[PDB]
Paper text:
Despite being phylogenetically distinct, a common feature of both the UK and South African variants is the mutation of residue 501 in the [name] from Asn to Tyr ([name]). Mutations that emerge in the receptor binding domain ([name]) of the spike protein are especially of interest given their high potential to alter the kinetics and strength of the interaction of the virus with target cells.
To understand the effects of these antibodies at a structural level, we next determined cryo-EM structures of the complexes formed by VH ab8 (variable domain of the bivalent fusion construct VH FC Ab8) and Fab ab1 (the antigen binding fragment of IgG ab1) with the [name] mutant spike protein ectodomain. Local refinement of the [name]–Fab ab1 interface improves the resolution to approximately 3 Å, enabling unambiguous placement of Y501 as well as the residues involved in the contact between the [name] and Fab ab1. Residue 501 is at the periphery of the Fab ab1 footprint, with Ser 30 of Fab ab1 in a position to interact with this residue. (D) Density map in the region near 501 for the [name] mutant spike protein ectodomain showing density for residues Q498, Y501, and Y505 in the spike protein and a loop in Fab ab1 that includes S30, the residue closest to Y501. However, there are marked differences near residue 501, which is completely within the [name] footprint, at the very edge of the ab1 footprint, and well outside the ab8 footprint. ELISA analysis of IgG ab1 and VH Fc ab8 interactions with unmutated or [name] spike ectodomains demonstrates that the [name] mutation has no significant effect on VH Fc ab8 binding but results in a slightly higher EC50 for IgG ab1.
Author numbering:
A (entry chain L): 1 to 213
B (entry chain H): 1 to 131, 138 to 217
C (entry chain A): 332 to 528
Write the structure that this text describes.
Amino acid sequence: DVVMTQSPATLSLSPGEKATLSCRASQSVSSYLAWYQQKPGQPPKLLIYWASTRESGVPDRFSGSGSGTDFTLTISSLQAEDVAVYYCQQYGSSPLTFGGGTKVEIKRTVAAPSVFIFPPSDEQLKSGTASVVCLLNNFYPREAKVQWKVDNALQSGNSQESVTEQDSKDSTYSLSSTLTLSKADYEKHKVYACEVTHQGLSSPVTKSFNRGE
Amino acid sequence: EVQLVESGGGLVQPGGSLRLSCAASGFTVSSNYMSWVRQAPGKGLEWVSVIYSGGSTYYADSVKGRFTISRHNSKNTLYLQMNSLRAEDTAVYYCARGYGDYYFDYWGQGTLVTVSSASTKGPSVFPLAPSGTAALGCLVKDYFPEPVTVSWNSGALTSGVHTFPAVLQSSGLYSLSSVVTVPSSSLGTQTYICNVNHKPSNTKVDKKVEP
Amino acid sequence: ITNLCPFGEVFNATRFASVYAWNRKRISNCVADYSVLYNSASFSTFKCYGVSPTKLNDLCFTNVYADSFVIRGDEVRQIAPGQTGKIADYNYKLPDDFTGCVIAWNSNNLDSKVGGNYNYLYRLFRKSNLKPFERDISTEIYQAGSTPCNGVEGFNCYFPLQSYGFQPTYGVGYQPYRVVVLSFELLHAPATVCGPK
Ligand SMILES: *[C@@H]1O[C@H](CO)[C@@H](O)[C@H](O)[C@H]1NC(C)=O
């Protein structure tokens, strides 16, 4: 069967540049190729079909070329709302197979995070579970480090991180670190701190709160 | 003008059965090529089945003999019956109109099919206490399965709302935090209520967040 | 031995037809040497269903129908009894009780063109599958959305015929294949097609 390989696996380019996504088939599939654009939390949208012909309603910056094994999808000018996953899909062979997908990222300017820390609610604390939430809001690049201090305690692996997808409006990320404790293992410490290290910060930002207030 | 609205997704035990329905508007499914295409969570798209304009049905090798694509012509509706579901069939399914099983110009919104032996559990919602600007939100914890839809003030506030993707805990249940940044002018004067909605457990939580 | 059947005017024809408008020639009132086809090295596919291949020189039929067209390489398997596909449903359907021989050979050196040969078409859209041995050359617009599509092409109104692009650099399975389907059908009229004595 045709094994449909996309390169590169991820692509990060500043806006206004030309992006070239390469797709390669294990066999020769002629011009029987389509390209799809899938936003996060949104169905895929057909961009081009027959490896060159644009779908109506697709803007003119998308184009395609190639034949047989090698194909290219070209975005002539990357803009803010093109943060999506792009799939090449053959339909010459009898089983329709999609590609692995290429995630396209936009290089905006470096933005320092806005950092908040949220204590556990008291209605949560009577269910035996405590959750402290450290929120990093509108930062770029994606690489940030969140270290938890519990009156300077060497915390290791007790937290879970969730990162939103890159926004189509301003190309910034948001991160949430959740630290989970037992209720009798919550109140043995007084002051909690979340320390964040990021490229856009000259010093690591520490946000702390007290249990007693 | 063309819309494809799906239903029937939910939690199902392994070896169970599930009947996905795709209603269509703007075209007749009795004279069009229709496909079901699934996407594993975190992985790429995979074509499942196709029904032709004349009624010929084809299936992928991993789903042949288990699934059954059909349509019911007098109501513009496409069905996918699934029997003996295994563990790797947990996926988001899309119904898609095709140009002769070549390319899919119109896609359905997609519905999630979860195959596990776990039970459906209603979420627990906890407020996040806020401290220019300030962030406030609510944490949805210990639910199964996806999705939980969080709106703010009956959907009237969509600016600055970050709904984080759910993470799998070591206990097997999911949790997501929904936050929103509000300036301090309306912080003490406006009440914010996050509508937590869970379709599988039928859970509606209108938990107000207050300073 | 006199008046051999004109298989040279069918197999060695200069221009073949497309599969939506497949040609039919009524081979009758002649004697047919089938073993000059079975011993020909050119034919890639030679499948006889209702009849053994070497027994064709002995059985006598009242007429043969030769249906000639051009399809893709991967679509050859659909020219068989009981198969299903685009060609089987909407272009050329064989019956389940089909007696005859399907012969297919690669014609990449004839029907392919460097700029693409768009002279060969196949029907893509139809409301229902064809009956066996049914010809449908209608090129009317396909009403796919049941809007008031009053003949004019556009959205949800597709042209039913798609063109096979044929180029010499294509892979096997996209190259053109000439297919001749011989259907030996035996009505209770006196038989006139036999083998050599
Ligand atoms: C076509 O012509 C070649 C050479 O002229 C011949 O060998 C072959 O038998 C012919 N095909 C027929 C008669 O079907």
